[PDB]
Structure 1
Amino acid sequence: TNKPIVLSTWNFGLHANVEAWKVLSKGGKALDAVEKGVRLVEDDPTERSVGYGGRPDRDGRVTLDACIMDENYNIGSVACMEHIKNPISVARAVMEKTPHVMLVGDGALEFALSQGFKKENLLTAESEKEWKEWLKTSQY
């Protein structure tokens, strides 16, 4: 048995893996390792397809989707949630703190706020700039 071990998608997964390994190499839970690992990307504004710095929907709104699943079929999910930088952690709270497994839209934000997460502006100057250039080319 080759353990511990972690796999993640794309080039930036190499960096996310380093964070997950800080947990895995010390005997920590896979659940903690994958949350910490992906939060790194959510936090980084230069990672434009995850959390902070994510390119918005056509209307200029940054809406995030995330889900988490542990070793015993417990699951949590948030979709189309705005203003919260770490949706993977809100998904973990949906899993651990509610009798539900999926919250979306306004209710997902409301639940996040109730859990102490802070409302932040996820739209970076760079993402806003690109969004506006897309509006010109697409003529939307």
Structure 2
Amino acid sequence: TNKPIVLSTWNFGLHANVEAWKVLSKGGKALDAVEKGVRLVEDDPTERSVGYGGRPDRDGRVTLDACIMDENYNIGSVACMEHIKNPISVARAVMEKTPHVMLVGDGALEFALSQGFKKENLLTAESEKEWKEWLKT
């Protein structure tokens, strides 16, 4: 068996993998490794397809979707959630702390605040500019 091992999507996976590997190489759990791996990209405002710096919807709202699945069919999911930089971690909170597996929209944000996540402005200057430029075309 070839283990531990992590795979991730796109070129930005390569640096995300290095973060995941800090957990996996020390014998840590796959769930912790994938969360930390993807949070790196969530946090990065220069990666504009994930998390902070995300290109907005047509109304200028940055809305994020995420889900997580562990080794025993535990799942959590958020969708269309605004203002929280680490949706993967809210998803993990939906999984671990509620009787539900998916929260969306304002409900998802309410829940996130109840768990201590911090409300933030995820629309960067660069994404705002490009959005206003798109409104022109």
Query: What TM bracket, shorter-length normalisation?
Result: over 0.9
Question: C-alpha displacement at 1:37, in angstroms?
Answer: 0.1
**What are the equivalent positions in structure 2 for 1:93-112 lying under 5 Å apart?**
93-112=93-112
Whole-angstrom distance in 2 between the partners of 1:11 and 1:38 = 13
Could you say what secondary structure the match of 2:2 adopts? Answer: coil
Query: Which 4+ residue blocks in structure 1 deviate beyond 2 angstroms?
Result: none
Once the two structures are superposed, residues 87-107 of structure 1 have per-residue CA deviations (whole angstroms, 9 ceiling, x without a partner) of 000000000000000000000
Shift of 1:19: 0.3
Residue 6 of structure 1 deviates from its aligned partner by: 0.2
Q: 5+ residue gaps in structure 2?
A: none
Shift of 1:60: 0.1
SS class of match (1:80): strand
Equivalent-residue separation in structure 2 for 1:15 and 1:111 (angstroms): 30
Shift of 1:13: 0.2
Superposition TM-score, scaled by structure 1 size: 0.98
Q: What is the CA-CA distance between 1:84 and the residue it aligns to?
A: 0.1
Q: What are the superposed Cα offsets for residues 29-82 of structure 1, whole Å, 9 maximum, x if unpaired?
A: 000000000000000000000000000000000000000000000000000000
Q: Which residue of 2 aligns with 1:130?
A: 130
User: Following superposition of structure 1 onto structure 2, how do residues 72-111 of structure 1 map, counting pairs within 5 Å?
Assistant: 72-111=72-111
CA–CA separation in structure 2 for the residues paired with 1:72 and 1:27? 18
Cα distance in 1 between the residues matched to 2:134 and 2:9: 26
Q: Separation in 2 of the partners of 1:134 and 1:17? A: 33
C-alpha separation in 1, matches of 2:110 and 2:116: 10
Q: TM-score, normalised by structure 2?
A: 1.00
The sequence identity of aligned pairs, in percent, is 100
- Is 1:18 paired with 2:18? yes
| RMSD of aligned Cα (Å) | 0.2
Q: Distance in 2 between matches of 1:77 and 1:44?
A: 21
Aligned residues between the structures: 137
Offset of 1:134 from its aligned partner?
Answer: 0.3
The alpha carbon displacement at 1:2 in A equals 0.1
